Amino acid sequence: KVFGRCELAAAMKRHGLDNYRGYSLGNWVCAAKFESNFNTQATNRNTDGSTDYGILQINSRWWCNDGRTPGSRNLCNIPCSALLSSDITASVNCAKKIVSDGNGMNAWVAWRNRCKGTDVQAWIRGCRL
Secondary structure (H helix, E strand, O other): OEOOHHHHHHHHHHOOOOOEOOEOHHHHHHHHHHHHOOEOOOEEEOOOOOEEEOOOOEEOOOOOEOOOOOOOOOOOOOEHHHHHOOOOHHHHHHHHHHHOOOOHHHHOHHHHHHOOOOOHHHHHOOOOO
């Protein structure tokens, strides 16, 4: 499923991401925009053999199991395919674990390079929240 900007902001707010670990809602919507273009079915393989899955592009080397990433951990304890569902619950729950890991949202390369230090509130403007 491809989410609309406000539709996703609403779904994320409902799942408790707004201000989670100090990151305002605009941050999460901006990260989603640039990581997957709001598409829950997005996948991208990396040079190290791992693969990123879903709207927040969660990596298979540490967070989920896709059966083809040797010596990988499954810290979120879920099959990576669950991260492609139209229901973002699984992605959100796993993202909450990732952002609490110590490096905050810097764990998402697109957020660090394209959202960090920008006016992220813009991503939720005009939204009925």
